[PDB]
Amino acid sequence: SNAMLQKINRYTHGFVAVPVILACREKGVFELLADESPLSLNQMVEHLGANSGHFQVALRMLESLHWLSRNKELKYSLTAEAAIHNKISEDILQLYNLPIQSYLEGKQGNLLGRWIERSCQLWNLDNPLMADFLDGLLVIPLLLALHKHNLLADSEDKPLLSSLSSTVQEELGKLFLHLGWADLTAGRLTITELGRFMGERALNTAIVASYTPMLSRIHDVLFGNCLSVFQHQKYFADLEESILSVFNQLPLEEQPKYITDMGCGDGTLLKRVWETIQFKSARGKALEQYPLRLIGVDYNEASLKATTRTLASLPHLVLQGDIGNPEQMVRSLEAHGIHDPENILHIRSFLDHDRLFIPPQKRNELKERAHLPYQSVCVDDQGELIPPHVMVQSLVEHLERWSQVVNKHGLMILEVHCLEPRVVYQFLDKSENLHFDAFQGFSQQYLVEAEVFLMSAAQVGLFPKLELSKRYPKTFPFTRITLNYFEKRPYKISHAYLSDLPALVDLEVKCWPENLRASTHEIRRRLELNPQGNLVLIIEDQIIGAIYSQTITSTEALENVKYAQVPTLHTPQGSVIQLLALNILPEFQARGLGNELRDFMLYYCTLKGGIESVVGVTRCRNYVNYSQMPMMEYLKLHNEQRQLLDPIVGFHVSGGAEIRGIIANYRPEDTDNLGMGILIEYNLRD
Numbered sequence: 001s002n003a004m005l006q007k008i009n010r011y012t013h014g015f016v017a018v019p020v021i022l023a024c025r026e027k028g029v030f031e032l033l034a035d036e037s038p039l040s041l042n043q044m045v046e047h048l049g050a051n052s053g054h055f056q057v058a059l060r061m062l063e064s065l066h067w068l069s070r071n072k073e074l075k076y077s078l079t080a081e082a083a084i085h086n087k088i089s090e091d092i093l094q095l096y097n098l099p100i101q102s103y104l105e106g107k108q109g110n111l112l113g114r115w116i117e118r119s120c121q122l123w124n125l126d127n128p129l130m131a132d133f134l135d136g137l138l139v140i141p142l143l144l145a146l147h148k149h150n151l152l153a154d155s156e157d158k159p160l161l162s163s164l165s166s167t168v169q170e171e172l173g174k175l176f177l178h179l180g181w182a183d184l185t186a187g188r189l190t191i192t193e194l195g196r197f198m199g200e201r202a203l204n205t206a207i208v209a210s211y212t213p214m215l216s217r218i219h220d221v222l223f224g225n226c227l228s229v230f231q232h233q234k235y236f237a238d239l240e241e242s243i244l245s246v247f248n249q250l251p252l253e254e255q256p257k258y259i260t261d262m263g264c265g266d267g268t269l270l271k272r273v274w275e276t277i278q279f280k281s282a283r284g285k286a287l288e289q290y291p292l293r294l295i296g297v298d299y300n301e302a303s304l305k306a307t308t309r310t311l312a313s314l315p316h317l318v319l320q321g322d323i324g325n326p327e328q329m330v331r332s333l334e335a336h337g338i339h340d341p342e343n344i345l346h347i348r349s350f351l352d353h354d355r356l357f358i359p360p361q362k363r364n365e366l367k368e369r370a371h372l373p374y375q376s377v378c379v380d381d382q383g384e385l386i387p388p389h390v391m392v393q394s395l396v397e398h399l400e401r402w403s404q405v406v407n408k409h410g411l412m413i414l415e416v417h418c419l420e421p422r423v424v425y426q427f428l429d430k431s432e433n434l435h436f437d438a439f440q441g442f443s444q445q446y447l448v449e450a451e452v453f454l455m456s457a458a459q460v461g462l463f464p465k466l467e468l469s470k471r472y473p474k475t476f477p478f479t480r481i482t483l484n485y486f487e488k489r490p491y492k493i494s495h496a497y498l499s500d501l502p503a504l505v506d507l508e509v510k511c512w513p514e515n516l517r518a519s520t521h522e523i524r525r526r527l528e529l530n531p532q533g534n535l536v537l538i539i540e541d542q543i544i545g546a547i548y549s550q551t552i553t554s555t556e557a558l559e560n561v562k563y564a565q566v567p568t569l570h571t572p573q574g575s576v577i578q579l580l581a582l583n584i585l586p587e588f589q590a591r592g593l594g595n596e597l598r599d600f601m602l603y604y605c606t607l608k609g610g611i612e613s614v615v616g617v618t619r620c621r622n623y624v625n626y627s628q629m630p631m632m633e634y635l636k637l638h639n640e641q642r643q644l645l646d647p648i649v650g651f652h653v654s655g656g657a658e659i660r661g662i663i664a665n666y667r668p669e670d671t672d673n674l675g676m677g678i679l680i681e682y683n684l685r686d
């Protein structure tokens with residue numbers, strides 16, 4: 001269940017969170033903020049000799065645990081939750097190196113008797129949340145060890161933990177009883193489905209228990225010589241879903257002839273792709289006439305030979321490569337005798353954030369974004385903090401290198417993303433961000449928000465086929481992983497900056513008559529107050545589209561206001577997005593640009609998080625030819641197809657919006673429709 005994964009999540013939360021809390025407590029982070037409370041990042045890193053980059057990662061984690069509040073001046077303060085640091089006894093760090101492999105084999109004595117008593121005791125803590133963190137340090141190593149021999153199973157053919165010495169039985173039983181992994185029914189231990197499930201999924205946390213050495217020198221990472229030191233399966237299920245779609249397309253003639261996975265690793269991804277294609281798709285039934293060659297790419301020869309072994313009975317090829325240089329790939333593929341790169345489907349899985357960092361190259365594009373409120377945290381080889389806007393700018397030119405190699409078959413990219421501390425806390429144990437974000441930042445990997453990554457592709461002409469693109473975690477209001485099947489499109493989409501006001505005013509006049517143009521004052525307001533609420537569609541360096549939006553407290557706040565008082569609907573902590581306007585030059589209408597721009601903005605607002613719906617008040621264009629009938633009977637009309645007659649309301653409704661009501665005298669100056677504005681809402685379903 002999700003609830004059990006949450007228990008797993010908070011076990012692995014402490015595995016990472018505890019070393020750093022202790023490290024911060026020893027250098028005096030908490031004692032400091034006990035004084036001089038309001039402090040900046042730079043204020044502290046100077047007063048502590050910290051590595052600003054890695055130390056910021058610690059702050060994000062601590063804020064995400066709501067031990068620190070970060071004010072609008074960006075300075076931190078303690079919270080009441082932060083007082084519990086005093087009772088985390090230091091010696092718990094000894095858990096990371098105990099010989100539990102041998103222990104289960106009966107050759108370490110009563111190794112885990114003193115801890116298990118302290119875990120049965122609430123680690124002498126009056127806080128169940130931290131007691132689960134501490135339990136992690138014991139729990140994580142055990143499950144890994146218990147998993148090498150599937151030791152956690154019910155008591156039918158192997159009575160639960162019956163192969164083991166008397167003491168191991170006694171100690172583990174006392175523990176599994178405390179943690180609820182087993183019940184002593186009928187005077188004999190029998191696992192609980194929690195215990196069973198805790199042992200089955202035991203490898204989710206274990207796999208990333210490889211953080212141990214960095215965690216042991218985490219005090220170095222934060223305050224000393226940091227330089228010396230350096231799991232859903234439906235991620236891939238949906239990835240396979242979109243592969244079938246690609247290899248069931250109309251003519252086999254036009255399916256990709258190559259599938260190149262950047263970041264082969266062991267090659268498991270490629271092999272799963274081929275079996276999906278082999279046994280399920282249409283291509284799999286015509287491989288003798290339309291061969292398909294897998295291609296593996298990776299910069300470590302180690303994993304290059306691991307995929308030669310994995311793909312060994314499969315038509316494949318292997319070569320060395322790097323994400324940062326997609327142009328060497330076509331040339332290496334040229335060297336390996338592939339002269340039709342346009343017939344390659346490109347895929348990759350969770351590596352763009354592990355690219356070798358290039359500094360940003362287009363300094364004007366750097367400064368446009370230097371005020372946007374990114375909440376990426378990233379660290380340089382010197383251990384200092386990289387400004388978010390530099391990283392994102394870096395990301396864009398990284399994506400542009402690839403956009404210039406992407407072909408008709410597109411670019412299918414899974415990727416992982418970080419989260420705002422305020423959101424991590426709200427969903428602390430529903431997501432694994434706290435430890436994953438904390439480590440991937442300590443490890444000099446580069447995580448950005450999902451909305452920002454998708455935007456980064458947008459600004460270079462890469463756009464997700466929303467049909468084959470999926471978001472995760474599906475049923476929560478945050479995006480932590482994205483499956484995007486980026487298409488290359490002949491345009492670009494980007495944020496509107498104040499520099500764009502001249503053209504956006506010119507835009508507003510070419511799209512509407514004077515009595516319907518948006519006030520220049522309004523447009524200025526939209527840009528200044530909604531930096532990430534304004535999307536622009538650029539073709540050949542000119543703006544040809546623009547969708548405006550802001551955040552509102554509710555749809556009920558709207559539906560009770562006139563167009564003139566919209567600016568007074570703005571609420572920064574709103575759970576709904578107001579669609580302010582959708583302007584497309586008449587020269588370039590009837591092309592789908594407006595349709596695509598609309599679809600993109602909706603998905604952009606889904607990845608931001610915390611937005612249940614997108615609503616707006618639109619106009620009718622052809623009521624003035626039917627005004628004899630009421631609006632509501634006109635809105636009911638249908639064109640030659642099964643779509644609404646009116647092209648404006650038609651456009652939003654076809655795009656999935658539902659007409660929610662009519663607003664009387666919303667736009668009085670709109671004489672054609674008698675001042676009536678038609679409210680709309682978009683599903684926005686997960």
Ligand SMILES: Nc1ncnc2c1ncn2[C@@H]1O[C@H](CSCC[C@H](N)C(=O)O)[C@@H](O)[C@H]1O
Pocket residue numbers: 262263264265266297298299300303304321322323351354355356
């Ligand atoms: N910058 C880069 N360019 C290309 N491949 C990269 C890369 N950085 C890392 N990789 C690849 O990503 C993979 C590491 S993850 C593979 C390990 C495997 N999943 C396991 O758990 O056992 C390796 O193939 C490595 O070569």
Ligand SMILES: [Mn+2]
Pocket residue numbers: 350353354440445
């Ligand atoms: Mn990584």
